[PDB]
Design a protein around this ligand. Structure first.
Ligand SMILES: N[C@@H](O)O[C@@H]1Cc2ccccc2[C@@H]1C1CN[C@@](Cc2ccccc2)(C[C@H](O)[C@H](Cc2ccccc2)NC(=O)O[C@H]2CCOC2)C1=O
Lengths: 99, 99
């Protein structure tokens, strides 16, 4: 779909059986999801942006469906204010920026 | 142009007669630039990011050329990790996400 930027580019994703609302973010190298339980083992990581840094748990090879398009990659879980889908998964669904 | 997201979507912007590099950020509602001198008055603005809130200075009606496209809008100046081109300016140059 062609998404305009008059409003926040939010989409529905499905992970671990549940459906969620996430923000497509070209500025984010990674993908961070709000506190949730995912299977597998994790590695701690610190990510920072505006406001500072937060500690997250890094899970690899996680399967996510973005607008029906399945994608697989690293997913960070932590105290983020909004679920954010970054470049690591956007490229997998063939997302591009046009102007 | 069409920008893929395999690497950071960095563009050069021209502001105040000088070139700077900025990141096209669809997850950012606003445009925030690193510390610099802009003309006129500024009013305060608190913006929230990944690590919390920061206080920035807001300058309105600022001429900024992005990748050759001229835009005139609100720019926030503060302690940001990188220059961020947000949705307020992405819509002015007609930028959309496609997949
Ligand atoms: N290293 C890098 O690429 O991203 C950092 C680390 C990371 C990892 C996962 C998800 C996000 C991020 C960070 C990003 C990615 N983009 C920004 C700006 C940035 C870019 C590069 C390096 C540091 C910081 C901003 C991000 O899009 C958030 C996403 C978000 C949306 C809503 C609430 C919280 C976060 N939006 C935001 O801060 O919004 C505003 C600033 C101006 O208008 C408001 C970040 O803070």
């Amino acid at each position: 779909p062609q998404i305009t930027l008059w409003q926040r580019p939010l989409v529905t994703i499905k992970i671990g059986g549940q459906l969620k609302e996430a923000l497509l973010d070209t500025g984010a190298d990674d993908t961070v999801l709000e506190e949730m339980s995912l299977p597998g083992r994790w590695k701690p990581k610190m990510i920072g942006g505006i406001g500072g840094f937060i500690k997250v748990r890094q899970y690899d090879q996680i399967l996510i469906e973005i607008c029906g398009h399945k994608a697989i990659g690293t997913v960070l879980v932590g105290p983020t204010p909004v679920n954010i889908i970054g470049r690591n998964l956007l490229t997998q669904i063939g997302c591009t920026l046009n102007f």
